[PDB]
């Protein structure tokens, strides 16, 4: 059905693109997403890096806030998406 | 908003080099809805800072009222995050 190839999202990325630092981001992304979103984005974040770093669902759980259900979902993207964590864990580990 | 995880989140996007990129990683953290009202509120914000009517933006983007004006508050009380980008997108195109 609905797909995320499209010409208004690469235009949204062109936007991000341009950001330069983490002031720039809070000032984007506030204007863009609710609280609850952002939130949420950066659990799933959270959650991703401690699934890379082997911790149990109860850890995961207990650091971040999220359920299994959510859990389960970052973790089906980790093991069978595009590998996009894992590319921004290397890169953000080269930087320093 | 403004914690250490959120930063952690932001570092990551601001590693991303090109559109290629932003697609493998906004398409592992976010799910396809999710995107989509993202890049909806996105253009929204364009056509109402260019003076489209609701009527025009609804019929171009499908939005709803609700969403159009909650990009509208965004535009009049917000961060001037959506003003920033659209200033420098402008000059990479100049």
Known sequence: ??????????????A???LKNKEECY???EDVCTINELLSLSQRFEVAKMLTDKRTY????????????????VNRSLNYGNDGYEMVFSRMKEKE
Do not use: N, W
């Open 1 to 14: 059905g609905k797909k995320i190839r499209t010409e208004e999202v690469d235009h949204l990325f062109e």
């Open 58 to 73: 109860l850890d995961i759980s207990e650091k971040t806030g999220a359920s299994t259900a959510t859990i389960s979902r």
């Open 27 to 29: 000032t984007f992304f």
């Open 16 to 18: 991000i693109l341009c």
